[PDB]
């Protein structure tokens, strides 16, 4: 305990009071004097017609030209976005994939899902074809997100209510992150890769630290399970999409919400969220078959990326911000610009 | 195109490989195995030969069955049950000896799921002999207070089947009910005929004639 429960309740009340004391003015009351970006008419420049099953993940290369797409067909095809060509087609051991990653160096591609294993594949093998460099088996739940810190390091979000930092050289969990009440369904590494935020299914987004291994802040502002997350390019904010048909802009330093990108005509939950280079546009995917483009400072729909026959599961903006790639369940990876 | 002609050629050949893999993977009948913990799932999957997911693929009458034992996933279903669409059927196993509310609730939640509106669920009521012995030992009203009727084995089985079929609300799907005594290997022929019926129905629906 009773004393411990009372202490937890009073600590939560103090945290909420401190967070609400710093909200002198909302985002919409200070940026209301700028011109909106208007109708952002983006046309499908490329369409990756190579997958035959639902696309559940897609990641952009550091060169903004190669993109890896993972589908339930058991394949992880690396795409040439400039010429639509495919440079690799890796047959996965387990076809039940829910996440994929591309190393910033470009040598490695991750993969994970219901197999409880985050596999690492060596693209630049001297023997030609891609070989599985490691199979990280330490999770008791389904892997939901994986990001490369470097060629050797990797952080994984799993469905056993925890996140684990791995070591691809040895295969053992260097660091484990515990504290999520529900399933951790999203993860996004910061630009400096010194920290990351995991958006779990308990309507909370916990800010972790890779070096320290302990959580710093929790963001309990949503009303349903968080299905997507993405850092603001400045690295001091992030937008988390949930099943409540709203994606909110959380601030790390303010430690609270900034704007709720919700519309009265939207009931479908977010499945993918991604920012532009400047962060003004938040291309947040929806289960309503459209990847709406949200003005991050106006909280208004700048444009709609209609053209997907099924729910979009992964939206990815290039590192040079030239194009945005949306991977929906209709086995299509469309490139918009 | 200076040497991008070889790059295109590689893209085309691996696209042909992807197409061949897709053709070779569409022949496999995907069946999702669900049910309450310790409900004969291990026994029924062992009777058909061969940590999170345990795929048990096998071939029966020139038809490749892929049976997925996803009961080991210690997480909520709704965040990963959406990847199990396009499956032929959901195989449901219930131990009639041990009583039941969890099994019925999970059946109601899985049959009314938006993704599984069209995917008909195969229902298995195993431990029939053990259930009859328990009926001869204990009444069936322990877990069914509202069940009024004869206390025989046949009536109890009929009541359980009715209570399980009273959970779906979509006419496009049918629940196939089978009873097993945990000592017969003929539980796969029922699976085969149910799968063939579902394939016929899905093909008719896809042609617009159903």
């Amino acid at each position: 305990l009773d004393q411990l429960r009372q202490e937890a309740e009073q600590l939560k009340n103090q945290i909420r009071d401190a967070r609400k004391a710093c909200a002198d003015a909302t985002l919409s009351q200070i940026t209301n004097n700028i011109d909106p970006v208007g109708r952002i008419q983006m046309r499908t420049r490329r369409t990756l017609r190579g997958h035959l099953a639902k696309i559940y993940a897609m990641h952009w290369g550091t060169d903004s030209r190669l993109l890896v797409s993972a589908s339930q067909d058991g394949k992880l095809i690396i795409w040439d976005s400039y010429t639509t060509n495919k440079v690799h087609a890796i047959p996965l051991r387990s076809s039940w994939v829910m996440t994929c990653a591309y190393a910033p160096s470009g040598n490695y591609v991750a993969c994970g899902g219901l197999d409880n294993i985050c596999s690492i594949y060596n693209l630049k093998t001297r023997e030609g074809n891609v070989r599985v460099s490691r199979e990280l088996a330490g999770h008791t739940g389904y892997l939901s997100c994986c990001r490369f810190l470097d060629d050797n390091q990797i952080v994984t979000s799993s469905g056993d209510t925890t996140c684990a930092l791995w070591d691809i050289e040895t295969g053992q969990q260097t660091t484990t992150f515990t504290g999520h009440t529900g399933d951790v369904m999203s993860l996004s590494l910061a630009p400096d890769t010194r920290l990351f935020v995991s958006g779990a299914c308990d309507a909370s987004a916990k800010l972790w630290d890779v070096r320290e291994g302990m959580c710093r802040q929790t963001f309990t502002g949503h009303e349903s399970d968080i299905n997507a997350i993405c850092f603001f390019p400045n690295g001091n904010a992030f937008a988390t999409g949930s099943d409540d048909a709203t994606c909110r802009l959380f601030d790390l330093r303010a430690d609270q919400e900034l704007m709720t990108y919700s519309h009265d005509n939207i009931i479908c939950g977010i499945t993918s969220v991604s920012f532009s280079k400047s962060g003004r546009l938040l291309l947040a995917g929806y289960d309503d078959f459209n990847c709406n483009v949200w003005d991050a400072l106006k909280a208004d729909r700048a444009g709609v990326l209609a053209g997907h026959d099924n729910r979009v599961s992964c939206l990815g903006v290039t590192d040079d911000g030239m194009a945005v790639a949306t991977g929906s369940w209709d086995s299509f990876l469309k490139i918009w610009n | 195109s200076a040497e991008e002609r070889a790059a295109l050629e590689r893209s085309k050949a691996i696209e042909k490989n992807l197409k061949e893999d897709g053709i070779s993977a569409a022949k496999d009948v995907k069946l999702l195995l669900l049910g309450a913990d310790n409900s004969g799932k291990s026994t029924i999957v062992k009777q058909m030969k061969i940590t999170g997911i345990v795929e048990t693929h096998f071939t029966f009458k020139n038809l490749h069955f892929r049976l997925f034992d996803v009961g080991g996933q210690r997480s909520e279903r709704k965040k990963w049950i959406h990847c199990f669409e396009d499956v032929t059927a959901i195989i449901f196993c219930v131990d009639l000896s041990d009583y039941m509310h969890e099994s019925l609730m999970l059946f109601d939640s899985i049959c009314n799921n938006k993704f599984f509106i069209d995917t008909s669920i195969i229902l298995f009521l195993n431990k029939k002999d053990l259930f009859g012995e328990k009926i001869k030992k204990s009444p069936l009203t322990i877990c069914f207070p509202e069940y009024t009727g004869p206390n025989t084995y046949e009536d109890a089985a009929a009541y359980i089947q009715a209570q399980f079929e009273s959970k779906n609300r979509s006419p496009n799907k049918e629940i196939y009910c089978h009873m097993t005594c945990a000592t017969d290997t003929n539980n796969a022929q029922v699976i085969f005929d149910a799968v063939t019926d579902i394939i016929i129905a899905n093909n008719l629906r896809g042609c617009g004639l159903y």
Partner: single-chain antibody
Amino acid sequence: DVQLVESGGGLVQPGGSRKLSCSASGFAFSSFGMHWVRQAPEKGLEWVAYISSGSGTIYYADTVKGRFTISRDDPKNTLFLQMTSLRSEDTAMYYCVRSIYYYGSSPFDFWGQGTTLTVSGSDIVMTQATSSVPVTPGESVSISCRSSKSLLHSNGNTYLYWFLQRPGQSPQLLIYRMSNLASGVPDRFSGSGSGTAFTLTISRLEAEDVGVYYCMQHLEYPLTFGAGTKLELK
């Protein structure tokens, strides 16, 4: 390890035929485009034939087309080069070269040991003015190469390949596409160029780096090599 071994060499009477087999192991042969590069006993390298993965496109040299035959055996993981009507100009060592083609790939990366065979207009012309650069170890040696047609394609890829053939050894790729260092090559090698004027600047030359260097173009077949810049001690 990755290894290419050729066989089927020896003295051949003029006007006959012979089959040269390139056995391969340690790598995925089925997904590689195997080349056949010939080197005269006293002259530089010269491209002969090329075959891609799946035996889709087969190209040939100006003086080789119509007589030779390049084929693969993917299940046997061996490369073949059938040649008929051996003229006196075919007396040379035949090298086996692997090359995989995709975005960011490194063609011509691994060379075979080589087999010795003895018989008793619009193509890009690559000219190397410096045929001998005697430089002591510890100094920087730069080899220049020129092309009749600009090698810079529309997509920004300039196709100039630099090789190093140590005496008694097989050529080793150093820089591919005139800017990208090969796999395992020491970082001291630097590649540069613009359109036609290409230079392979080497820093801190060592005793093990003594050899002859070549420049190869891949903009359009046939792939023509240079005269060969030979580096000697002191």
